[PDB]
Amino acid sequence: VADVVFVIEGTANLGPYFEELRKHYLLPAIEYFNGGPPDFGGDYGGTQYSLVVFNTVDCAPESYVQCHAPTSSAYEFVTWLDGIKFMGGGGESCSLIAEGLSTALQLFDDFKKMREQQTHRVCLLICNSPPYLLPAVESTTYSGCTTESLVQKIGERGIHFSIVSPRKLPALRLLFEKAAPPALLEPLQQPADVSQD
Template identity: 25%
Template sequence: MAAKRLIVVVESTAAMGPYWETILRDYLDKIIRCFGENDSTVQNSCSNVEFALVSYNTHGCYSGCLVQRTGWTRDPDVFFMWLSSIPFSGGGFNDAVIAEGLAEALVMFPNSQSGDPNQQNVDMHQHCILVAASNPYPLQTPIYVPQLQNLEQSETIDSFPGNRLYDAEAVAKAFPQFSISLSVICPKELPKIKGIYNAGNRNSKAADPPVLAKTPHFLILISEGFREAQGALKVGESCSKMAPCNANSSAYISSHMNNKEYVVFQAMNPYGFRGHLEDKKKLLLQRLLFWINRELEIVALLQFLFGK
């Protein structure tokens, strides 16, 4: 049986804080329990289900790290502890770096390319849930996205080999090409977040998915390839095989949420955030050069308009 993997990509700005307990209790808890119910009788070390977490913030000096990630875990209790220990702070009025968060999740999945990127796979084993409370950063930024192989150039997200600038929708288009379902949970009905979902679910023949929100003004769009999540959130259906992964999830939330002095994701040790340090250094250098070039363009434009 193929391994099943789920990555939750969460916005860690202060804008998400007031809604997080509701999202975790009413949506993520049910999805995670249903996702792992087939392996509920198997010990965690032998489970065929893996979970991981990615958090992202915004640009600016008042925000924390742009993107952070955990390793993989097969223990749903550990995963709930990670989710319950996210410190929500910063952000201000800035747009969130959703593109960077999705790209980080994309590189964490094993590379399994879909044969037909335009056909939605209804039996997917790899899933990503984007949890966002802010609009995506509007400009394209330097982001590493895995390159697609054996696809026509018109079908790839990177038509030009040297292009490394992407926005959130451009990154989302890569998910179906790698057989990864993309779903979204948003406490606000933001059209741009729905646009990201549509970009990651490009089956034009399929009707719009039902909005499975039980909370007013929430936007809950679940990919048709994520059957466990659809079953978990449908009215009248429940996951009876598996007991709640962590009965004290609310206690975790109340004790750690919005605690600025709390060490970021301290509960994740000994797993910790893992990444390719050299790749991150290169990406940071690319971003620095990107913003320097943009500043030089602005200076040149001002000199042209107003003279030296």
């Protein structure tokens, strides 16, 4: 139960803004599943989640993914990745991470092998720069596109997925509602933390 996924990618595009968003959207979201971030035992408790933030090909010709957050007790490594994510990312502003979200799908896969005995799987991804790229994975067997990623995240599994970007709105939300299963990308609002994004 309560199988959530936390993703952010705008580190290269916009770092400080995330720090602001953390003060209003990221931190309250975690409190929905914990009595308060302190330092506790970690195991297969259902309510665990991951923390995935990477960069683009601009100044990283030797690294795309280094995620590691199986349980983290939802407090310690969560707060760590929040406050110690990154400060890099240059090049230009055309695309930061699309191939990342595909890997995110792969993460859900391991839940099928780990969360045996449903769980109403949920996921959330953040990215300031509007992404677009030809490559798909370059890391694993699975391959596709942004369209393939979203149809997998919606149809293949009923994972509720939203994108709480900065107050600005790019040309992304439009295509991300072409899924017959309700995407529910609504939680991009200055109002307080939604119950389940």
